[PDB]
Design a protein around this ligand. Structure first.
Ligand SMILES: CCC[C@@H]1CCCCN1C(=O)c1cccc(-c2cccc(-n3ncc(C(=O)O)c3[C@@H]3C[C@H]3c3cn(C)nn3)c2)c1
Ligand SMILES: [Cl-]
Length: 288
């Protein structure tokens, strides 16, 4: 059985929680806290290990952007530090290709990064790769057919509908078709042949809309909207369904977890997180 792991997040201050949800029975398990509270991070998995990447510790005693990479082993219930990134990256996006972690964009104070770097677990080393064509924080990242996509975000001045693709063997970014909606702090994932962008902030409102990019047609199509408007949501895929976790709706730090069934084009409520929060990192791996 595989669990949906939610790491960190924000309610009043940045959080250290690691909790795991089991779709097979509705249960939540609280696991070992992150060593350092963080929101605006990303989660990913490589080799059955959960990684927490970037973020920011928003705390009453100071706000510190994170260049940290930390590894959680479900077999031991222990977090271990890895090599830090070249730069702090709050409101980060990440994607995994060929067992390597790409860290994309994010902020360091008023610096909005276009830079991108790649982590190799076997060497515990980060190396920079070609930068994006656009500065993006709150960037959605996903991987399809061993290509890396950076979707929407905030460039320092404007929220973006634009998106771009990284071609690893050319070390090159190229724009793709823009979304039909400006989205910053959306949830972005892959399902089947499509990149999905769910929710986010358009500069005026938190969004419930959802659209998907078919790489074969190079077009974006809206699907059913989520039941809750949400920015700074966590998103992942478990057994062919998209799950979205928490976020912010202009009013509440959501505990809502919803899931999308692509065959029925429907969202449904599945569970509540143990407490409302935004800016989590989420990924899926084996039970502890
Ligand atoms: C730190 C509290 C303030 C924060 C931002 C305003 C709404 C409340 N709050 C959060 O709950 C929160 C906390 C921690 C992290 C994140 C977090 C995570 C990942 C991406 C982003 N991100 N990257 C770009 C943008 C943007 O503004 O363009 C965003 C903000 C989410 C977008 C938003 C703005 N507003 C009014 N509502 N939503 C933010 C959020
Ligand atoms: Cl923040």
């Amino acid at each position: 059985g595989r669990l949906i792991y939610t790491a960190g997040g924000y309610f009043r201050q940045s959080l250290s929680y690691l909790e795991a949800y089991n779709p097979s029975n509705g249960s939540w398990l609280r696991l070992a806290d992150l060593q350092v509270p963080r929101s605006g991070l990303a989660g990913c998995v490589v080799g059955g290990l959960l990684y927490a990447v970037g973020g920011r510790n928003n705390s009453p005693d100071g706000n510190t952007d994170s260049s940290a990479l930390d590894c959680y082993n479900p077999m031991t219930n222990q977090w271990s530090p890895c090599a830090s990134m070249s730069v702090p990256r709050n409101r980060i996006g990440v994607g995994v290709i060929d067992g390597h972690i790409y860290a994309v964009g994010g902020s360091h104070g008023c610096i909005h990064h276009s830079s991108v770097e790649r982590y190799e677990p076997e060497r515990d080393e980060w190396h920079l790769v070609a930068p994006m064509l656009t500065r993006r924080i709150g960037v959605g990242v996903a991987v399809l057919n061993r290509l890396l996509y950076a979707v929407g975000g905030f460039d320092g001045t404007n929220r973006l509908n634009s998106a771009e693709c990284y071609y690893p063997e050319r070390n090159e970014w190229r724009m793709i078709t823009p979304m039909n909606t400006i989205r910053s702090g959306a949830g972005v994932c892959v399902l089947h042949n499509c990149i999905y962008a769910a929710g986010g902030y358009d500069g005026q409102d938190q969004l419930n809309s959802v659209e998907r990019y078919d790489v074969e047609t190079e077009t974006w199509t809206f699907v059913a909207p989520m039941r809750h408007h949400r920015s700074a949501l966590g998103i992942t895929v478990h057994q062919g369904k998209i799950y979205v976790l928490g976020g912010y709706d202009g009013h509440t730090f959501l505990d809502s977890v919803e899931c999308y069934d692509p065959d029925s084009d429907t969202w449904s409520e599945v569970t509540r997180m143990t407490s409302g929060r935004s800016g989590v990192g989420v990924a899926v791996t084996m039970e502890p």
